[PDB]
Design an enzyme around this catalytic site. Structure first.
Site, PDB file in Angstrom:
ATOM      1  N   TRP A 140      17.232  58.229  84.804  1.00  0.00           N
ATOM      2  CA  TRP A 140      17.484  58.009  83.763  1.00  0.00           C
ATOM      3  C   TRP A 140      18.451  57.887  82.738  1.00  0.00           C
ATOM      4  O   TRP A 140      19.334  57.018  82.272  1.00  0.00           O
ATOM      5  CB  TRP A 140      15.485  57.907  82.678  1.00  0.00           C
ATOM      6  CG  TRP A 140      15.368  56.108  82.242  1.00  0.00           C
ATOM      7  CD1 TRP A 140      15.055  55.445  82.054  1.00  0.00           C
ATOM      8  CD2 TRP A 140      16.332  56.157  80.436  1.00  0.00           C
ATOM      9  NE1 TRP A 140      14.288  54.847  81.037  1.00  0.00           N
ATOM     10  CE2 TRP A 140      15.476  55.867  79.487  1.00  0.00           C
ATOM     11  CE3 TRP A 140      16.615  57.933  79.446  1.00  0.00           C
ATOM     12  CZ2 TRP A 140      15.956  55.370  78.368  1.00  0.00           C
ATOM     13  CZ3 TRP A 140      16.649  57.332  78.201  1.00  0.00           C
ATOM     14  CH2 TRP A 140      16.800  56.259  77.773  1.00  0.00           C
ATOM     15  N   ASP A 159      13.355  53.168  87.561  1.00  0.00           N
ATOM     16  CA  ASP A 159      12.538  53.800  86.262  1.00  0.00           C
ATOM     17  C   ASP A 159      12.455  53.531  85.215  1.00  0.00           C
ATOM     18  O   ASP A 159      12.028  54.036  84.249  1.00  0.00           O
ATOM     19  CB  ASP A 159      13.050  54.800  86.672  1.00  0.00           C
ATOM     20  CG  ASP A 159      14.408  55.261  86.174  1.00  0.00           C
ATOM     21  OD1 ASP A 159      14.837  54.397  86.260  1.00  0.00           O
ATOM     22  OD2 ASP A 159      14.940  56.593  86.197  1.00  0.00           O
ATOM     23  N   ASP A 160      13.068  52.417  84.637  1.00  0.00           N
ATOM     24  CA  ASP A 160      12.866  52.168  83.443  1.00  0.00           C
ATOM     25  C   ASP A 160      11.472  51.335  83.251  1.00  0.00           C
ATOM     26  O   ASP A 160      10.458  50.479  83.265  1.00  0.00           O
ATOM     27  CB  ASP A 160      13.586  51.317  82.632  1.00  0.00           C
ATOM     28  CG  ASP A 160      13.769  51.329  81.458  1.00  0.00           C
ATOM     29  OD1 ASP A 160      13.847  52.591  80.339  1.00  0.00           O
ATOM     30  OD2 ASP A 160      13.106  50.127  80.972  1.00  0.00           O
ATOM     31  N   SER A 161      10.792  52.180  82.167  1.00  0.00           N
ATOM     32  CA  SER A 161       9.007  51.269  81.828  1.00  0.00           C
ATOM     33  C   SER A 161       9.329  50.322  81.323  1.00  0.00           C
ATOM     34  O   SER A 161       8.660  49.536  81.564  1.00  0.00           O
ATOM     35  CB  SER A 161       8.008  52.282  80.579  1.00  0.00           C
ATOM     36  OG  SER A 161       7.405  51.750  80.464  1.00  0.00           O
TER      37      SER A 161
END
Length: 206
Positions: A140, A159-161
Site C-alpha cells: 500500500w 488493496d486500498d480499503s
DNA sequence: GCTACAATCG
DNA sequence: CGATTGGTAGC
C-alpha cells in the site's frame, strides 16, 4: 501530464460506459503528484498517511515541517536524524511511525535508499521488492508513493480499503470486493489505472 | 456531540 | 492478540 491526463480521460471514456459516466460527472483529473520530492520525503509522506485521512496527515506534516525545519521546508535527513523519536512523536506521528521515519532518514543519509534516478528506472515490481525491505513500507505504502510522488499512471491500489468501498458501489457488487477482484475489474483501465483509481476516489465528493 | 475510518510488535 | 497518530464526514 496534461496530455497524459486528457489521453487517460479519453481511454476511460472508451471502455464500458459507467466509466464514461463517472469521468463526465467528476470532470478533469486534478491529481497533482510531486516527483520533485526526494525518495526519503515521498516515503515518509506515504508512511504518515497510513490509516490517516489526508487532512489528519497534513496537520502532522505541517507541524513536522514547522518545527523540525528552519524554513518550513521538508526536514532534511540530517535534521530528522538529529531529532529523537520522542520529539517526532509529539508532532503527531505514532510512536511506531516515529521509529520507522527515523530509520528512513538514517537510510537516506547513508545512501541506503535507491537513488531517485534508479527508482525511475525500476518497474513497479522491482520497486515493490526493493522498498518493501524498509520497515513500515509494504504494498500500500509503495503504491501511494508511486502515485503521489513518482507520478506513475498505471498504479491500481486494489488493496486500498476506500477504493474497495468505491468499487463495490461503482461495479454494483453485493459485498466489499477482495483485492484480486478489484484488480480484475479494473484491467480494462490500463494503461491509466492510476487515473481510474483517482476517479473512483472522487465518488464520495459527488 | 460522537466516533468510525497499514504495518509492526511484545 | 490488541494497541496505535488525528481531522472530520456522517449520524
Amino acid at each position: 501530464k496534461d496530455s497524459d491526463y486528457k489521453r487517460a480521460e479519453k481511454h476511460l471514456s472508451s471502455i464500458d460506459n459507467k466509466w464514461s459516466s463517472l469521468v463526465k460527472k467528476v470532470g478533469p483529473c486534478t491529481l497533482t503528484p510531486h516527483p520533485e520530492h526526494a525518495p526519503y520525503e515521498g516515503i515518509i509522506r506515504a508512511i504518515t498517511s497510513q490509516k490517516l485521512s489526508d487532512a489528519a496527515t497534513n496537520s502532522i506534516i505541517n507541524k513536522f515541517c514547522t518545527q523540525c525545519s528552519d524554513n518550513d521546508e521538508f526536514p532534511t535527513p540530517k535534521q530528522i536524524m538529529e531529532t529523537d523519536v520522542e520529539t517526532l512523536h509529539e508532532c503527531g506521528f505514532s510512536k511506531l511511525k516515529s521509529q520507522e521515519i527515523h530509520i528512513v532518514a538514517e537510510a537516506a543519509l547513508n545512501k541506503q535508499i535507491p537513488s531517485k534516478s534508479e527508482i525511475e528506472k525500476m518497474s513497479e515490481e522491482e520497486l515493490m521488492e526493493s522498498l518493501s525491505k524498509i520497515k513500515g513500507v509494504k504494498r500500500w505504502t509503495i503504491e501511494m508513493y508511486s502515485i503521489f510522488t513518482l507520478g506513475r499512471l498505471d498504479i491500481m491500489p486494489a488493496d486500498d480499503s476506500t477504493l474497495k468501498n468505491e468499487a463495490k458501489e461503482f461495479f454494483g457488487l453485493s459485498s466489499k470486493p477482495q483485492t484480486e477482484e478489484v484488480e480484475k475489474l479494473t484491467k480494462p483501465c490500463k494503461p491509466y489505472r492510476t487515473i481510474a483509481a483517482w476517479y473512483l476516489w472522487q465518488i464520495p465528493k459527488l
